[PDB]
Structures are given as C-alpha cells and as structure tokens.
C-alpha cells in the first residue's frame, strides 16, 4: 500500500510536478506496478526531466516516454552533496552518439571516438571521456547546486493491481440504521452483535 502522505512530510520539493494524473487522484486508483528512479542532477536541468523534452540529460542520460505516467519530485540537497574542494563522484554522460529510448541505461565507460582517428585506449586530442563530473561545491548557485530527483512511473496493466494508497475506516456504529461499506460490501441496515 503506497501512502503518498509521506511524500508531503518530506523536503520542500523545489519541484513537484505530476503529469496526466493529479496528485489528489493517484491516492484513489490502484496501479499494478511502480518504478522509482532516483538520481542527482543540477538545478538547471530539473526542467529537462519531463516527457518530450530536449537537453543533455534529456537526450543521453535519462529520457522520459512521450506518454509518461506518474510524476517527478525534485528537491535541493545542498546539505549533502556539497563538499569543500568539490565533490567529484557524481558523473554524467556528456558525449553520446544517439538518443536513448525511454527508461534506458548507458553505463558504458569507453573513450568517445568522435573523430576520424580512432583511440583504442589512447586519450589524446580527439579522444574524449564522455563522463563529466559535477562540481556541486557549497558556494555554487541554485542552478549548479545539486538537486535530488525521484521519478515515479506507474503501470496499470491487465495484471491484478497490488500497489495503491490506503483506505480509511470510520468508527463502528451499532443498533442504528446506517450505511455500511465492509471491504467493498455496501449496504444499509442495523448492525447487531451476533453469535454466528
């Protein structure tokens, strides 16, 4: 059961944008599968994370489907990823030959042979390593400060649905004509203690 009330209790959510479905709706319908995709980007590229968008991250690193279902939750994390002397452990693919199909991974770490002359292990002149590392220094501006992103994607296929938000229960009222809903059994009447 996916309680999204814990979402709002979290960080200010610099960006909290839900596509197609509304935030008040996703706690009602019941999906069959959820994918949570987490990463760290720059503030400048947070707008790049959107269906049908263009940019370095949109093209080569993380491409949303044109009919993406779900939503994106981004929040600043300058408390964590900011380190004095620059935090050089967060990489991103600067060089690529093509555009990724939606929800694809490109972990290949090779020299980008973008010139006529091949490299084959020689990183000289026209021989580039496509993974550039962010600075994420504490003094960087809002655009270049690190921002964490989680994209939630929902699948509601013909398979039985097993992920969706919680259902509330009221008190129990007896010896009074009321309207009851017991696990989906809906009726009206007087509820009494029994010995069945």
């Amino acid at each position, epitope marked *: 059961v996916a309680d999204y009330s814990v979402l709002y209790n979290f960080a200010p959510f610099f960006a909290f944008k839900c596509y197609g479905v509304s935030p008040t709706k996703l706690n009602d319908l019941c999906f069959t599968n959820v994918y949570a995709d987490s990463f760290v980007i720059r503030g*400048n590229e947070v707008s790049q994370i959107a269906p049908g968008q*263009t*940019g*370095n991250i949109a*093209d*080569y690193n993380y491409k949303l489907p044109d009919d993406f279902t779900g939503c994106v939750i981004a929040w600043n994390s300058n408390k964590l990823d900011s380190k004095v002397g620059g935090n050089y452990n967060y990489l991103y693919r*600067l*060089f*690529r*030959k*093509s*555009n990724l199909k939606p929800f694809e991974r490109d972990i290949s770490t090779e020299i980008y042979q*973008a*010139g*006529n*002359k091949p490299c084959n292990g020689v990183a*000289g*002149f*026209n021989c*580039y*390593f496509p993974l*550039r590392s962010y*600075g994420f*220094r504490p*003094t*960087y*501006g809002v*655009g*270049h400060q690190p921002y964490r992103v989680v994209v939630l994607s929902f699948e509601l296929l013909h398979a039985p649905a097993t992920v969706c938000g919680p259902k509330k229960s009221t008190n129990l009222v007896k010896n009074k004509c009321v309207n009851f809903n017991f696990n989906g059994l809906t009726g009206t009447g007087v509820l009494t203690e029994s010995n069945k």
Partner: antibody
Amino acid sequence: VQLVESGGGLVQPGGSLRLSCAASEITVSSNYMNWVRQAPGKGLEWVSVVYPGGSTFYTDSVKGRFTISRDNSKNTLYLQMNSLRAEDTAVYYCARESGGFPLAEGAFDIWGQGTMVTVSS
Amino acid sequence: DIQMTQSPSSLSASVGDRVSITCRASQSISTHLHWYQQKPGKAPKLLISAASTLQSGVPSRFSGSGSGTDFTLTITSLQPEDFATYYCQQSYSTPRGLSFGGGTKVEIKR
C-alpha cells in the same frame, strides 16, 4: 582538422541563403557544432548549436528563423537562412565545442575561417 | 542574461610587460568561463580553458585564474605578436545563454 566555410555573400533584405561548412578530422554527426555570429568591428555572438545526437538550439534573436543541419554525405554543416534583415551583415563561423587536449567543456577550441554574409539592397 | 564587463577596455603596454585583464559577470560563473584570443581579421583562438587551464601548444606566459564572479587572465611576457583582442565567455547557460565580453585590444606602446 579543418572547418572551411562556403556559401556566403551579399543578398537583398528578405532573401534566403545556404551556408556549408566542410569538416575534416571531426564528425558533424558526433560532436557539438556551433554557428557563431561576429559583426565587423564588434564582438562575437553565439547563435546556434547542434548536439552530437541531432538536437538543435538557437539563440533568442533568431529562434524560429535559422535552420541548422548536419550532412553525413560530405560531413558538413548546413545553415538555412530566410527573411534576411539589415542586421544580418556579419561573418558566420562554424566552431567545434568541447575541444582541447585537457578536455575542458564550454570552449570553442576550433574556429572556422568564417564567411561574409551581408544583407542590403 | 549573463553580462560580462572587461577591464581595462583598452590595455596599451610595451612588449615584455606583464599585463592582466579582468572579466566580471553578473551572476556567479565559477569555472564555466573561457578565454579566447582573436586577431583583427582572424578567427578567435582559444587560450584559457576551464577558466584555469592552458591549452596544448600554447606558451607558458599566459595564466588564467580567478573565481566566483571576477576572473583574471595574465600574460607575463607579452611578445610582439600578442597584440590581439581577448574575450571572456561563460558556459553557465550553455544551452541558450551564450554571451561574450566586450574584448580588449592590446596596442603597441610608443
């Protein structure tokens, strides 16, 4: 490596023109190719870029008006300009982005010889 | 919308004198600015990369430094055919916001 310009000239206001920049030792369809504006006597002005993948961006002044293209038949850069105006008299340069031995991005390491495009009647 | 002011606008200095240009942007650029050299009538040539790194095949006299919003480029021994224009260009808004500084012409002193 070389980025030679071709197709520049003088055209009346409201005309159309093609610029072709032939590239040697570098791949148009695999690198960051930039069209840059430089007025006679003034400073530089970046106009447009095409990413290695094929995505294109234009500067705000000429958005919707320039068409940038990559030609694999001759590993060349194409630029289509239409509805030319009086401010379009300058030298255009085809430049390579993300160049240099130390691998520093944001830089125009390689500049073309630049071609004249003057728009007047 | 990143605006750069270059000081001095014109720097007249004799050969062999250590000169120093400064470029100042509006909002912080950090290390995403580069220094290029353009001759009058020639295409620009890159000199300072990463805002601090000298290129390959370039003389060791040049030095790019500075950080935050003030950037510096210094030439320790300005040899006679160095009298060109120097440009500072930011890459902070490298998608669309590519803008350049005014550029300083170095003129021979007499």
